[PDB]
Copies of this chain bind each other. A is one copy, B any other.
Amino acid sequence: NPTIIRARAPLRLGLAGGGTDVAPYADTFGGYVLNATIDRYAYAVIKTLTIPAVRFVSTDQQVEKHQLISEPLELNGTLNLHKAVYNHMIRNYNHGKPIALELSTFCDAPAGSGLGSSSTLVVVMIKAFVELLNLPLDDYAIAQLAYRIERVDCGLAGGRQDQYSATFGGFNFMEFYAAARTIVNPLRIKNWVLCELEASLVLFYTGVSRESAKIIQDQSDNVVSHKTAAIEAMHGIKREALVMKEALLKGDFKAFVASMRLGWDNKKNSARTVSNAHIDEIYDAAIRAGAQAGKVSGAGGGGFMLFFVPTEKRMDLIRTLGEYDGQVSNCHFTKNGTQAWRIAN
C-alpha cells in the first residue's frame, strides 16, 4: 500500500559569525558561527506511487515528472536538489533500482529570507528518505551529506552552518576547520536567559535578498586576493561570534548587545552589498526608537533583520517598524532538529 512520509526542519537565525564558515576563510583561519533555530520550518513529503514514475515538486510549485529509468537523473537546472537527493538515495541505499515516488517540498519562508532555507530544504529531503528507507544516518552524517549534495553534486557555493542548524536544532556554536571538519557545540542556555532573549528580540522581514551569492563571492575573493582590511573585517566577525557565545552562557546581556554591534559593523565592512541605504534607514530608525543593536540574518542585502530592544522600548520599536516596508514578528526559538512522521504505512 502507498506510503506517505513527511519531514520538517527548523529554519535559523544567524546570530554571529556568518560568512566565516565559507570555504576560503574556514579552510585558512577556521570559522565560528553562533546560530539558533526558530519556529519556522522547511518540509519534505514523500509519497510512493502506484505508477512507474518519479515526480518532483518544489516550494514555488515547479514540477518535473520522469519515467522509471535505471540511470541517475540528469541535473539539468530544474529541481537539481530534489534530483540529487533522489540520485544519492537510489544509488547508495537501493542498489541503483529506481523507486516510484513523489518528492515535494514547501517552506514557511521564501527564498532569500536570510533564514538558511536553501540548505534546510536539502536536510529535510534527506530526513524524509532516512525515514522512508530506515537509514542509520546520525546527525553529523545527515549534515555532511546535505553539504555534499548541495555544494558538490549540485555545485552551489556557500558555507556549512545551515546544514548543522537544520539537522541538530537549538542554539549552537559551530567551529569550522579545513577538510570538512566541523564541531557542533550545543549551548545549554539557562531558561531565564532564553526567556529574556525572546522578550528582547524583534524580527523584521525586509523583502527578498538577491545578494547572498554576491556577498559570499566577495568574501571568498577577500581571502584569495589578500584584501587586508576586508580580511580583518572577517576576523572581527569571527571574534565577536565567540564573545556572543560566552555572553549567552554567562547571561551577560550587556556583552551580548556590544558584540552584536561590533559584529554588524564588521559584517558590513566584509562585503559591499551586506547593507545598503534602505537597510541602513530601517536600522537607523530602529535604533532611534530604542533598539540597542541589530543586524541582517544570513549573508546580507535583504531578508530578515533582528533587533535587540530593552523591554520598555519594545512596543515603540514595533510601532516604528510598522512605518517601514516589511513585516514585524516576535522571535521564538525551537530546541528540536529535523523530525519525520508517517501518515500512511
* Nearest B residue to A330, CB-CB: B108
A208 within 8 A of B: no
A70 within 8 A of B: no
A341 touches B41 (CB 8 A): no
User: Count of A residues near B, CB < 8 Å?
Assistant: 33
* Chain B residue contacts of A191, Cβ below 8 A: 341
A59 within 8 A of B: yes
Tell me how far the C-beta of A159 lies from the nearest C-beta in chain B, rounded to whole angstroms. 26
A311 touches B199 (CB 8 A): no
B195 touches A6 (CB 8 A): yes
A315 touches B61 (CB 8 A): yes
B329 touches A332 (CB 8 A): no
A43 touches B199 (CB 8 A): yes
* Chain B residue contacts of A196, Cβ below 8 A: 6, 341, 343
* Chain B residue contacts of A342, Cβ below 8 A: 192
B106 touches A40 (CB 8 A): no
* Nearest B residue to A60, CB-CB: B315
A329 touches B329 (CB 8 A): yes
Tell me how far the C-beta of A252 lies from the nearest C-beta in chain B, rounded to whole angstroms. 12
B39 touches A330 (CB 8 A): yes
**Residues 176-198 of chain A, each 1 if its beta carbon lies under 8 Å from chain B, else 0:** 00000000000000011001101
* Partner of A195 from B104, B315, B341 at Cβ < 8 Å: B341
Copies in the complex: 2
* Chain B residue contacts of A339, Cβ below 8 A: 195
* Chain B residue contacts of A139, Cβ below 8 A: none
A67 within 8 A of B: no
* Chain B residue contacts of A311, Cβ below 8 A: 6, 43, 45, 104, 106
A327 within 8 A of B: yes
A327 touches B330 (CB 8 A): no
* Nearest B residue to A316, CB-CB: B61
Interface residues of A (CB under 8 A from B): 6, 8, 39-41, 43, 45, 57, 59-61, 104, 106, 108, 191-192, 195-196, 198-199, 311-312, 314-316, 327, 329-330, 332, 339, 341-343
Q: Which 9 A-B pairs have the closest CB atoms?
A: A192-B341, A39-B332, A108-B330, A106-B315, A195-B341, A39-B39, A106-B314, A40-B330, A61-B315
CB pairs A–B below 8 angstroms (24 shown): A6-B196, A6-B199, A8-B195, A39-B39, A40-B330, A40-B332, A43-B199, A43-B311, A45-B312, A59-B315, A60-B315, A61-B315, A104-B311, A104-B312, A106-B311, A108-B330, A191-B341, A192-B341, A192-B342, A195-B339, A195-B341, A327-B327, A329-B329, A332-B332
